[PDB]
Write a protein that binds this ligand. Structure first.
Ligand SMILES: C[C@@H]1C[C@H]1c1ccc(CCC(=O)N2CCC(C(N)=O)CC2)o1
Ligand SMILES: C[C@@H]1C[C@H]1c1ccc(CCC(=O)N2CCC(C(N)=O)CC2)o1
Lengths: 192, 192
């Protein structure tokens, strides 16, 4: 495990400077202080190394959202949504290189695409359930189907966070993204 | 030009069945009824063929939005936004294979990334100007900075349209996407 961790830390550090294309199995072995065949004992490929890194990041966010769901903030509905979106902003924003490369690999990799898909379905379902609960309590109006509204809003966040972290043009500055997403969540969830 | 058009039509037809990776210069020449070296006279690579296809699609949408801007519908503010979003839905939705592959190539191709960036900046700027005009006339409240609000909403549409057209999981069904986006535009633009 200590050497497995080494390989993962090396991959994360290198992904800060280059894409996964420009990183070889030899670069990973070298940084982890192991040989090439020893690398292949822990991981079958550099793609599997990414997949593991991405799995850790996605579970960290998922576990943080579970924690929030169990310990609701004693706060207004705007800060409720802000606290939830902030899980993603801080989690992925603390692992931008992994996040970016994990998104790029969605195009090439079946398991990476499936990992993203699974967790997106889960977070969408949760969002939809909160919206439904808000509607049942009379705080939000019955406008769009909750699960479609949840899907769009979650996709917005994915795209917008990714663009901000990558400093794409165009993008919302990183110091304005949370406010910008929360406004659009709150107005569209509560707006008649 | 007739042979250039042939190559483009062949590329568009093939991209319906495979990604650009699985299409070779030989497949393109073959479908256009030309030789391989004759192909290289018209285009330097299969990437340039995509780039041309994508440029045509993006300009078609841009010209449609210009047309709308010059001939405003005599309609309420909700149908105003719907008519604009619908330009993208119908334009890109009529060229899904090109649209999808053009998005995939953003990761690999500098010119493709720049083409998308240019036009996104333009459509964001336009959106922001309409929002500002709506605020000046007192129809919309001064909430978020207009250009940040415009950026998020345009990124939402990009991601959501792409997912819908690709039938990703998760996605908004294609027959519900326009309604879903328009709701979120209108509530967030006009919602206090
Ligand atoms: C960067 C990573 C893919 C993108 C992403 C997915 C989901 C999000 C933010 C939205 C999110 O999932 N929420 C928002 C917070 C909400 C809550 N009440 O706790 C429900 C869960 O960002
Ligand atoms: C599929 C293609 C990238 C994604 C995209 C970009 C922009 C959009 C839809 C939003 C758009 O640009 N609008 C929405 C309509 C609006 C108007 N008042 O005319 C301003 C322009 O979708």
């Amino acid at each position: 495990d200590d050497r497995e961790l080494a390989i993962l830390a090396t991959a994360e550090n290198l992904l800060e400077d280059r894409p996964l294309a420009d990183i070889s199995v030899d670069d990973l072995a070298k940084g982890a202080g192991i040989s090439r065949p020893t690398f292949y004992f822990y991981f079958p490929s550099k793609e599997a190394v990414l997949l593991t890194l991405l799995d850790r990041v996605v579970n960290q966010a998922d576990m943080a959202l579970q924690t929030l769901a169990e310990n609701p903030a004693d706060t207004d509905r705007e800060n409720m949504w802000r606290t939830g979106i902030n899980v993603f902003f801080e989690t992925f924003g603390s692992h931008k290189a992994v996040t970016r490369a994990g998104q790029a690999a969605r195009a090439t990799s079946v398991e990476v695409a499936e990992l993203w898909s699974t967790f997106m379905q889960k977070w969408i379902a949760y969002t939809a359930a909160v919206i439904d609960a808000e509607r049942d309590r009379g705080a939000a109006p019955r406008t769009l189907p909750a699960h479609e509204l949840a899907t769009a809003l979650n996709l917005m966040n994915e795209r917008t966070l990714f663009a901000s972290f990558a400093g794409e043009q165009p993008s919302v500055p990183e110091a304005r993204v949370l406010d910008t997403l929360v406004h659009i969540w709150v107005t569209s969830i509560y707006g008649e």
